[PDB]
Design a protein around this nucleic acid. Structure first.
Ligand SMILES: C/C=C\C=C\[C@@H]1O[C@](O)([C@H](CC)C(=O)NC/C=C/C=C(\C)[C@@H](OC)[C@@H](C)[C@@H]2O[C@H](/C=C/C=C/C=C(\C)C(=O)c3c(O)cc[nH]c3=O)[C@H](O)[C@@H]2O)[C@H](O)[C@H](O)C1(C)C
Ligand SMILES: Nc1nc2c(ncn2[C@@H]2O[C@H](COP(=O)(O)OP(=O)(O)O)[C@@H](O)[C@H]2O)c(=O)[nH]1
Ligand SMILES: [Mg+2]
Ligand SMILES: [Zn+2]
Lengths: 99, 83, 374, 208
RNA sequence: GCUGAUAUAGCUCAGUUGGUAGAGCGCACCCUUGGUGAGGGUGAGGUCGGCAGUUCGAAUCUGCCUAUCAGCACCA
RNA sequence: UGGAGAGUUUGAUCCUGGCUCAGGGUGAACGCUGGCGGCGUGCCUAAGACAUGCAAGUCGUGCGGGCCGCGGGGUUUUACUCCGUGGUCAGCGGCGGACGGGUGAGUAACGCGUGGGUGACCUACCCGGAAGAGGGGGACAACCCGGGGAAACUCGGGCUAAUCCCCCAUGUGGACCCGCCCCUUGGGGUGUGUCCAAAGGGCUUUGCCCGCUUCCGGAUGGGCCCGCGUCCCAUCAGCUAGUUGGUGGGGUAAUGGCCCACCAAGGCGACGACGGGUAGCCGGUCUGAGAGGAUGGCCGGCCACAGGGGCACUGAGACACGGGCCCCACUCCUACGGGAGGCAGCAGUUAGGAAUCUUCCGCAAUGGGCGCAAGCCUGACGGAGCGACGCCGCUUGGAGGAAGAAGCCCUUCGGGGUGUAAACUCCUGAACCCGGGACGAAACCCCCGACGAGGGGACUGACGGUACCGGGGUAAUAGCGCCGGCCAACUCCGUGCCAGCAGCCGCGGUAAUACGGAGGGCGCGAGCGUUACCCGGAUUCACUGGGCGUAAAGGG
């Protein structure tokens, strides 16, 4: 009746999730990131962006977001962030971003 | 990948394959890249195989996979031989 | 394996010929693994044709008589002699059918000294009245109705555990014995009249009918000669008897023949499938006939050239013009003749083939092709 | 197929004496010698100025019917004789000469055209080595047509091959009479071919 | 393959009430023409779809069968 | 190197002009007749519905067990069954199902065609080069036990190994915020900071072998974009609100209104917008002297669709032919609680129709998938079958053979035609009978040599016991159309504007070359006629190449 391609489906619902999570982590990361980079959390702001960069790239390591997929999200995270650490911030903990 | 197979030209029972380069996924007698030489099975005519050596090599120096019998028609065509 | 023989029932309506048929199978399944109907004793294989046993349907019942080696006159205990019986009985001689085994069914009904043996008197007396073994006939006793419900309880029962169960063998023993198996000359070409026509998923047109000569198998060229257009040559791709594949299916087995790539129109009844070159369409032909006398049930008057009755060849029923050769005029009954027929429909003839000449719900004459005019 | 039938009836009709039967069609009775007129019931009464058409029809037929080539080939072969660089006059005619069987006939071997054809359809003929049975096989320069061996001792091959002693072959063909060979030195010529045919008309018959 | 209905002169189509089968449109030979129309003349025929049985009497009651029209006859 | 004409308006003539014939083309059909082979080709309608079979799998050289048979019994025996080793059944994990194949429904469209741009981009496997591959934790299947259940299956808990998964270093390197430099749409280099690498499998084990990580260069195939070209209706005239642009975001591999907020009001249109019809486009195809006209089916190229409609996951790649999620129409099972199904893949049924194929043989070749290989899967493919559908090749006989049978038909009764035609005599010998009997097939592999070059060896053929060769050898199918003219081909009879013919003009009303048969004759031949449809002739939509004072046409 059936074909061993379902093999290719179950083998999906899996990765189908494996990267879904890695995804929604960067989202809940980024939000919770800029969410503080604009408030004035210089230190404990980059802290997150430096954490993000990490979680984002590793995603790249897989079939999830690839190539520019993250190279993109970065140039906006640290982009957006710093463009907030100017509402009277000064990148205290010069963790990820650079002067 | 990019291989070096053959295309079945010639009537029924009357083959006349054509040695050529083409992105594997193509259809046998399907559009290919550039021609390299021919082959006549029944060996009718002492002119039943040529292969543009010079050209045959370029395609390899850049990564071209021949067939198993394509490998051969080249072996008969002394392509790897370098002395 | 076990020799095969196409059989059936006959008789007057409501007697039970239709249901006796029910009993015959069933039972035969207990002591026989893997079991028109099909059942098989522990000695033979079998084909049965419950006839419609009723006026009107006769026309396809007679074609049912042509298709059998033996008739099973069924009769009721409470009843006995009956009109439809007297009828579906003389037609037993006309259309071959050698030997006849009467089964007094409903046996289990109103007791009586005579009756039981008084009925065998209205039988045996009515049997010789038609020049048959009216004296030495296998008359069995044991209502099949009643036995057909004993096997329904539990689908397994050997050699008669319920009286009537064994009384079903009085037949399953009286028919094996008594009624031998004739020849079906396979050394001849091929041939076999068409009874009906079916259609199927992937297959298509299948032909039902008895094989007369030789044998067929997948990969054989054949001719479909039988009225309309012209003979149609086709290859047989399906040879299955009784719902299951028959390998070479010879003469004496009504299998379904699948004629490659055809339609269900080009293959209607009264046709014939034979060896490419066996039989051809012929509309005019000589033939020595036997006008059936008035005392034999047929014409009680006679006729004159120009008459036009109906001839029944094999499994057909057609109308032709009788052109009596100069001098041949008012040829009365009980008389044999020799004239010609000109069927209004081209038909499959092979010179020296038997046929009859009827008219008006009665048999009028017996003929056999002599030579073919056209 | 290639007609097959009364052919000394066309000796008539076209009224330009023909010899498709060879020996007899060559005697004092080519059928033509007794009836210079078309067959049929009438055949000998006034004639309407044959239409510009007509003419061309007789001219073709005259030729096409002078070989055995059934239209289909002839007109087909005609076409080939067009594209071919050069006058359609010669060429075609030549092209009609290139016929293996004809050639045979052209080179003794057989008494008439209709005969040379059977010779090819039975094996008796053979070219530069291997043998041929296609009346259609077209002959090329320097190719010699040879009789087979199994036949050489045949009653017919005899007499027929005898008619050579003395007579000479067409100026584009040779002949080893004893070794039955003779080559095809070159596509014959308009003048060489003394045929009762006005090619230039047969041509005109196909533009319309 | 089972029934049901329709089968009436060349065509339309009347009817009966079991018994010497109608109407007109047409149509055939006339006189006339070149031929026809028209005009004046003369009429001459129905296998009641077909083969067959019943009656003293068969197109009307019986039986069969043929072209055609309508039907949950109809997968070895 | 290339152009041909006529029949028809008259009492007759010339002019305009419509119609029509002679030509060539066809995936055809219908009629009558039908012997062969090879090469082609074979639903043009219902993108209708499909009882069955087969189309996509392959790795133990990624890993761990189930299991059937063999090595040696842990100890000392059956015990903690440990291990040597090949089949085998799923499961895990990998590359592959996104090509091959099928169809044209849709679509007037940057869809296709074509020439370009990408400083706006991707690409598995494939070769070149640079650097590497050190340590670490764990889950779920398989399996064992318990359950619901008609079933399809599936729920609970418990171990378990990996090239499956996550964390650290490692930073040759690449990705990002920012600053400088040369360059100019995001390309190239440079400094600080941040951020990511990774798997072991095989045997002959400090060395090969297929892999892994990141980087870069090459190749191949792609996405997007642009000028240009792309059918009819104007009795269709105005069309638009995410509509036109901006700004900042989301999303993307990437540009962009693609999407969304904000503003501004634009954008398009007689150079034909908006709407309606039709239709997959080209390479090409038929015709034509050419220019044009008509066309887009065999094969290739691009696109589109996979029962109808929507969608996302997986991945380099699809929003997925034979995978998934849902709605719908419809079919099948049903323990009536919830399952199952898409042949526009191959073979075939049926429905419609004027009409279009075998439930096939083989993987030997070729080609594609997976592997170290062996080799396995392959209805793509290579062959075969049916169909005069087409083309080309072939036969039904060849040479004799009468002032001229017979029969049939005209007949100025003298005699003329069928007719050398037949008969007959030679001869050849399609078939049928006999034996031999193919190439296509040489490599993966093995051996010397490093699995290099090179050299050496072997197995392997579905069509086939067919083709072709040699031997023997029987005279052995013919049919259709037409004969007043256009147009090759004439007479007798029957018929009496009746029966009937007819592409056009027209024939038939008691002599018919025209109706019907006959004799005869002409074209063609397994074909030949008819119908349908494209071009031509038609300078008859005219550029080539026309016309408008009365023929068609000047606008009052
Ligand atoms: C009859 C239908 C189809 C026949 C088909 C073919 O018949 C056959 O051609 C056949 C070949 C011989 C054939 O021609 N049959 C054709 C003919 C065959 C005739 C044969 C034999 C006879 O002999 C003279 C035979 C019956 C004979 O008659 C006697 C009977 C007399 C009866 C009088 C009636 C009586 C009292 C009566 O109450 C009565 C009645 O019966 C009917 C109606 N109303 C009545 O009131 C006696 O019984 C003898 O035995 C082949 O068999 C074919 O193979 C076939 C089967 C295809
Ligand atoms: N008394 C009795 N009646 C039976 C028997 N068999 C059948 N019948 C009844 O007889 C009648 C007709 O039966 P059926 O088989 O149809 O007879 P058919 O007319 O020959 O087909 C029905 O009522 C049956 O049930 C039997 O053995 N005995
Ligand atoms: Mg059944
Ligand atoms: Zn002559």
């Amino acid at each position: 009746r059936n074909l061993s391609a379902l093999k290719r489906h179950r083998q999906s619902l899996k990765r189908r999730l494996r990267n879904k999570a890695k995804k929604s982590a960067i989202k809940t990361l980024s939000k919770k990131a800029i969410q503080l980079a604009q408030e004035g959390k210089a230190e404990e702001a980059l802290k997150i962006m430096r954490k993000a960069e990490s979680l984002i790239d590793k995603a790249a390591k897989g079939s999830t977001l690839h190539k520019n997929a993250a190279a993109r999200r970065k140039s906006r995270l640290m982009r957006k962030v710093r463009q907030l650490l100017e509402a009277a911030g000064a990148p205290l903990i010069g963790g990820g971003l650079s002067a | 990948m990019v291989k070096i197979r053959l295309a079945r030209f010639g009537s029924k029972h009357n083959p006349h394959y054509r040695i050529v380069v083409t992105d594997a996924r193509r259809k046998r007698d399907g559009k290919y890249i550039e021609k390299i030489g021919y082959y006549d099975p029944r060996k009718t005519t002492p002119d039943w195989l040529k292969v543009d050596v010079e050209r045959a090599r370029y395609w390899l120096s850049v990564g071209a996979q021949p067939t198993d019998t394509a490998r051969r028609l080249l072996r008969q065509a002394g392509v790897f031989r370098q002395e | 394996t076990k020799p095969h023989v196409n059989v059936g029932t006959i008789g007057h309506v409501d007697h039970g010929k239709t249901t006796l048929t029910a009993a015959l199978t069933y039972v035969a399944a207990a002591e026989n693994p893997n079991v028109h109907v099909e059942y098989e004793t522990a000695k033979r294989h079998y084909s049965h044709v419950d006839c419609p046993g009723h006026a009107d349907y006769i026309k396809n019942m007679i074609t049912g008589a042509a298709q059998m080696d033996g008739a099973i006159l069924v009769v009721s205990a409470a009843d006995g002699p009956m009109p439809q019986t007297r009828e579906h009985i003389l037609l037993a001689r006309q259309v071959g059918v050698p030997y006849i085994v009467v089964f007094m069914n409903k046996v289990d009904m109103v007791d009586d000294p005579e009756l039981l043996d008084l009925v065998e008197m209205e039988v045996r007396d009515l049997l010789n009245q038609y020049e048959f073994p009216g004296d030495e006939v296998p008359v069995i006793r044991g209502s099949a109705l009643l036995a057909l419900e004993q096997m329904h309880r539990n689908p397994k029962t050997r050699r008669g555990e319920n009286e009537w169960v064994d009384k079903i063998w009085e037949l399953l023993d009286a028919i094996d014995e008594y009624i031998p198996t004739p020849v079906r000359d396979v050394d001849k070409p091929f041939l076999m009249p068409v009874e009906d026509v079916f259609t199927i998923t992937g297959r298509g047109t299948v032909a039902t009918g008895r094989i007369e000569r030789g044998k067929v198998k997948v990969g054989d060229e054949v001719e479909i000669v039988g009225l309309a257009p012209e003979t149609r040559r086709t290859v047989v791709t399906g040879v299955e008897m009784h719902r299951k594949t028959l390998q070479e299916g010879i003469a004496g087995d009504n299998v379904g023949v699948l004629l490659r790539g055809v339609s269900r129109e080009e293959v209607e009844r009264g046709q014939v499938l034979a060896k490419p070159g066996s039989i051809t369409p012929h509309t005019k032909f000589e033939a020595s006939v036997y006008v059936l006398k008035k005392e034999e049930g047929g014409r009680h008057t006679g006729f004159f050239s120009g008459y036009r009755p109906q001839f029944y060849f094999r499994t057909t029923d057609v109308t032709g013009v009788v052109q009596l050769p100069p001098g041949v005029e008012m040829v009365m009954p009980g008389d044999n003749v020799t004239f010609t027929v000109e069927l209004i429909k081209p038909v499959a003839l092979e010179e020296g083939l038997r046929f009859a000449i009827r008219e008006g719900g009665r048999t009028v004459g017996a003929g056999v092709v002599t030579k073919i005019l056209e | 197929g290639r007609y097959i039938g009364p052919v000394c009836r066309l000796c008539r009709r076209e009224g330009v004496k023909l010899y498709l039967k060879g020996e007899r069609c060559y005697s004092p009775k080519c059928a033509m010698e007794r009836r210079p007129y078309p067959p049929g019931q009438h055949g000998q009464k006034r004639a309407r100025r044959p239409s510009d058409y007509a003419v061309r029809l007789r001219e073709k037929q005259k030729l096409r019917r002078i070989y055995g080539i059934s239209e289909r080939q002839f007109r087909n072969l005609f076409e080939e004789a067009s594209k071919k660089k050069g006058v359609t006059g010669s060429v075609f005619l030549g092209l009609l000469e290139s016929r293996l069987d004809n050639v045979v006939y052209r080179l003794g071997f057989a008494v008439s055209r209709r005969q040379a054809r059977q010779l090819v359809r039975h094996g008796h003929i053979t070219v530069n080595g291997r043998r041929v049975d296609l009346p259609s096989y077209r002959v090329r320069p320097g190719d010699e047509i040879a009789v087979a061996e199994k036949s050489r001792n045949l009653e017919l091959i005899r007499q027929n091959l005898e008619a050579m002693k003395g007579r000479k072959v067409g100026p584009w063909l040779s002949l080893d009479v004893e070794g039955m060979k003779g080559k095809f030195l070159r596509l014959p010529d308009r003048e060489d071919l003394a045929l009762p045919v006005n090619e230039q008309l047969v041509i005109e018959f196909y533009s319309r």
